[PDB]
Amino acid sequence: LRRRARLSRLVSFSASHRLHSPSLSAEENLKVFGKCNNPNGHGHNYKVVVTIHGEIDPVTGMVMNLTDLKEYMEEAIMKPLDHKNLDLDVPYFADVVSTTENVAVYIWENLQRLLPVGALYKVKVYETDNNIVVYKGE
Template sequence: MPTWKLSTEFTFNAAHQIRDYNGPCGRMHGHTYTVKLEATSHQLHASEFCPHPVMVADFRTLKWAKKDVFKGGLDHCILNEVLPEGYETTAEMIAKYIYDKTKKSLPDGVKLKVAVSENPNSWAEYEDD
C-alpha cells in the first residue's frame, strides 16, 4: 500500500506561565516555540485551497498556529488566555492542543504527529492512534 508522509516545521512567539509551578516557569515568561508536524496517509486528498486530490494535507492548513493570534493562530499571544480549559501551557499540552485543532481540519485517514519545543534541546511529541 502506498504511503505519503508530509513534514513541516514553523515557529511562533508566545508568553505563558505554568499554573502552580514552584519555580521560574510559574512566572509569566515567553518562548519562541518550534513546532514540527508530520502527516501520513495512504491516499492523497484535495484541500480547502486545491480541489484536486494531490496532497496528504495542505501546508497552509498544517501551519495555522503560526498565524497571529488575531488571525486565529497562536503567534504573539498569552497561551494561558488562548488555550481552552483543560489544556495547561506545558509543551506536552501545547502539542496536544495543536494536534487536536489541526486534526479537525484534516481528511479522514490522515495520521498526525505534533512535536513542540520551547528551546533547541527539549521536545514534547503528541500523536493519537
C-alpha cells in the same frame, strides 16, 4: 497499489505563558514549575513540526499538497497561537496548564477538526531547542 510516505512541515510561533495550576498552592506551583512559575510570565519561539501520512499521489507525487498543509497549519497553529499569551488569549488554556505536552495536544486537536480523517500522524513541539514533546494521538 500506491507507496505510502510521511510528509512534514515546520512553522514557528512566538508566545508567552506561565506554568501554574490553581489546583496547587502558591508554594507547590513554585516547587513544581520553578522559574516557569514567574508571576508575570515568560515566552518562547515555539517550533512545530506537523507530520501527515498517506499514499503518494501517482500524478502529482504528493502525499498532501504542501500548500494545503500550510493553510491547515496557518488555521490550526498560527492564527490562535502566534504573538499570543497562551494562558490569557487561548480559551483552551484557561483551565489547562500550558506545558509543552498540552500545547502539542492542543495543536493535534485543532488539526483534527480540519484535516481529512487518518491524515494526521504526529505533532512535534519544541518549546526550546532542548525541550521537545511528540504527541501522536495516544
